[PDB]
Design a protein around this nucleic acid. Structure first.
Ligand SMILES: [Zn+2]
Lengths: 265, 264, 235, 52, 48, 49
DNA sequence: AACAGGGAAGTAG
DNA sequence: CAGGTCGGCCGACTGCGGCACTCGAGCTACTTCCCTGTT
DNA sequence: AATGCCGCAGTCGGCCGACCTG
DNA sequence: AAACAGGGAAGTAG
DNA sequence: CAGGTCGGCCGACTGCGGCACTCGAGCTACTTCCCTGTTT
DNA sequence: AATGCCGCAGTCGGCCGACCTG
């Protein structure tokens, strides 16, 4: 009878429920029959699978990308860099786009923040040039090229773009500023020393104060590479869509989406 | 001390938490302070409000719109007519689009589904043309125009467009069909009779036949237009985001988003 | 290991304590490394700062450099400007505040730009009061650091080299007490036994421990490492 | 029909118009749904008579 | 309609006064300040 | 009734403006610069001041 | 003065 | 009067959508409008 | 050559001091 | 005559 | 053997999302590679 | 002169009967 449903779909592309109620078969059989049909569509609505990793210390993992603030005119090319631990952000409106601009922003941000162990960015031609590669090599800082056409790879610095644009528009409507550099500096000051979180803690002091951690909870964990719920393991950090489990036997901590985290007691 | 926060926000445009934990003010006060600045941007990511009405009796309220099925060639214009109670769908492959073509589609839909009490569409030039207006007047069918640039008022027929496009693409990849009308007819047949619901009820016999009348729950209701939780009342229908409450003191059924209905 | 200190001093020219706390090098070895360099021979942070302007002939047109240094933490900043007008000092104030924060009050000199009403009203809006051995010391330090870094003539603009030198002074140039200018400005470590070399390395911050396994967290390593309790030492 | 279909006394003309299908009732009022009418109407139970 | 509204900027309950409209959980209450009406969430509105 | 609204055509926000009437998800706003009131879905209505 | 092409103008899809 | 209740207050939680390198031109279609031509 | 994110803002609810009251 | 230097086109990615 | 247990089973609920009238052109930056006049 | 809809698919969780075991 199941094979009869098979040619029924092969002729029609019925849905799962109609198969179930018309051929007296279980729901899973109908769902897999729908999945098997080559003409049946590919599921674009995928749930949360990939999570962008974050450093566990200030000055460990950074993200860098360019944007466009058309208000500045010839200073539209705004380069930004956000620390992935404390959300410490920096930017300088530099005209044009070349290795020189990236190097200057790197130096200024380095002075602003410090030495991160490695930096991840997009695949823009400037970020892939040789000169910047030996620049990072001489500075002994690892570089990650990222996946092409994947803004979610730099989702953190894109949310940073959102914050920068919001603050710039706010302070522009607030009044008038002498130089675009002045406006950018004031916005950065507000963001990194005044716009502090609900925990009563500015981004700067987190970036440069002692790291505090209460006894972290022991939570059950689901692993993607085996399809089994293995644990429990220590949970380092958590939030909205990100969790950093780390078993004892793991070489490096594993970052997983929040849908695969379960409380344990 | 609230004044200090006032000029602090006026100068820096801070967040609520900084004001609360720097000037020792209520979180409500901080939110009000960040609200009161005109220079602060307006809230753009607003939650859901407003629900498209759907006639609780079949053949009462319909929706209609056009689309662009580019693979049909000169017949690329598809007119889509869908019910709201049972989501019964009809379509045709009419080359171009004119008041005469829209009228032919209306007649075909009437033959295929029946006579609806009223039809609600977009602000397309065809549906504002007088000829259709006096045609509907002759047939005694009310009309609704909707707000321009706002497909959200036709979201039902938009989702029906999504369904029809998916089905026709599947059938196109399935095999070879003589004419676009033939393929569209096959897809409509599948969607109406074969593509059954999740409750063991084909869309065809939901469109016709007896109405399912379960004992309706006595649920608590929030009145959006008065900001007061008033109830309990009768819950007519429910689904994903939409609900129907028809209190005794109200003359007509009320369409509200589901989140404002709190079960009692 | 000392070769790493060689490139580090070549590119940054830090004091001996910096290298000795960066690579665990001997103090005398650090002194020898420093000597090998050819051209290289308040009570509460963010309370009171010092404002003054100094000139450097190498910039030529950009000698007009505003400099801000803290009384207590001695954290430093500079800006490359074409003049010393009111707007230049205002922009430097804004950028320095973004760099460093907001002090209780500011002590300046008697320059016409400092006394002008623009700076006065700008400070009044920001709720800060307005009023040189330390600043002149830093002027010597930055100019010395500018000359030390000038060895590698690859900097495209004075902003690049200035930022690199300010970075050296702030985060690389580190004191005797074991804290950088940044750490002092912004305010249970367990001894850890390495297994690659078998030597005890630290001290390092502890994350957690359990079932005979300790999640010791190295300072230089970017990620935690799980180590048995046999290779840990209380400190 | 599993559900009853009861007689309805319209108030606009004061005449017993129907009979029509009932939906719900309570508190002296019934949610009577006329076939011609596009929306349900609330009618006092004193004006609703069972039909068979 | 005479209603009670909360002066949530100061945290107190001022009134009574007229209530103009509603919607979006907001009541456009009109205090004795005839300069311009204000808006308050309905949760802080009480009929009186 | 002083209301922030959004020009739904371009998305750029025009306001503040005065509210004539509203009900059940739609708002009828009549700005002074326009000769006719604008009917807008209640998704883009904000209570200015 | 007048209307009937008719081209434009406006508007929504 | 302290048990009982209510309101203030905030941790915790959550629906939403746009950051993605930039914005636009163009066609169809009916109706309102008066020019250019004709009553 | 290495994976979406979170601020704004509304909302639930537990905490707790003041007020009702057997 | 084999080697070499702009110059250009082309491909990829933001 | 019947109380307890695991599994087969499905109602029930949720995260993502493109349906909106159709579409592109073009930007700047860098590297690799090929072409034509220049050198020994 | 009128309001975001809902299928495809994963996933919890109770329901129930074959089956382990008291
Ligand atoms: Zn040196």
């Amino acid at each position: 009878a199941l094979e009869s449903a098979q040619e029924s779909h092969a002729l029609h592309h019925q849905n799962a429920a109609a198969l179930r109620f018309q051929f007296h078969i279980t729901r899973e059989q109908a769902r897999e029959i729908v999945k098997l049909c080559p003409n049946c569509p590919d599921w674009g609505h995928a749930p949360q699978l990939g999570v962008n990793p974050r450093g566990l210390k200030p000055r460990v993992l950074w993200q860098m990308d360019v944007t466009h603030v058309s208000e500045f005119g010839k200073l539209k090319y705004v380069h930004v860099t956000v620390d992935t631990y404390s959300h410490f952000t920096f930017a300088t409106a530099r005209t044009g786009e070349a290795t020189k601009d990236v190097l200057q922003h790197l130096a200024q941000s380095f002075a602003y923040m410090g030495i991160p162990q490695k930096i991840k960015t997009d695949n823009a031609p400037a970020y892939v040039s040789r000169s910047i590669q030996e620049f990072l090599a001489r500075w002994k800082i690892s570089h990650v090229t990222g996946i092409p056409y994947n803004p979610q790879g730099q989702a953190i610095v894109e949310r940073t773009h959102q914050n920068i644009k919001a603050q710039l528009n706010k302070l522009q409507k607030a009044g008038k500023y002498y130089t675009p550099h002045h406006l950018l500096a004031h916005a950065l000051f507000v963001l990194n020393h005044v716009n502090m979180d609900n925990q009563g803690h500015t981004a700067a002091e987190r970036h440069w104060g002692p790291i505090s951690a209460d006894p972290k909870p022991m939570v059950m964990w689901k692993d993607l590479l085996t399809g089994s719920w293995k644990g429990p393991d220590v949970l380092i950090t958590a939030g909205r869509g990100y969790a950093c489990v780390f078993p004892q036997d793991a070489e490096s901590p594993i970052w997983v989406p929040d849908r695969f985290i379960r409380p344990f007691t």
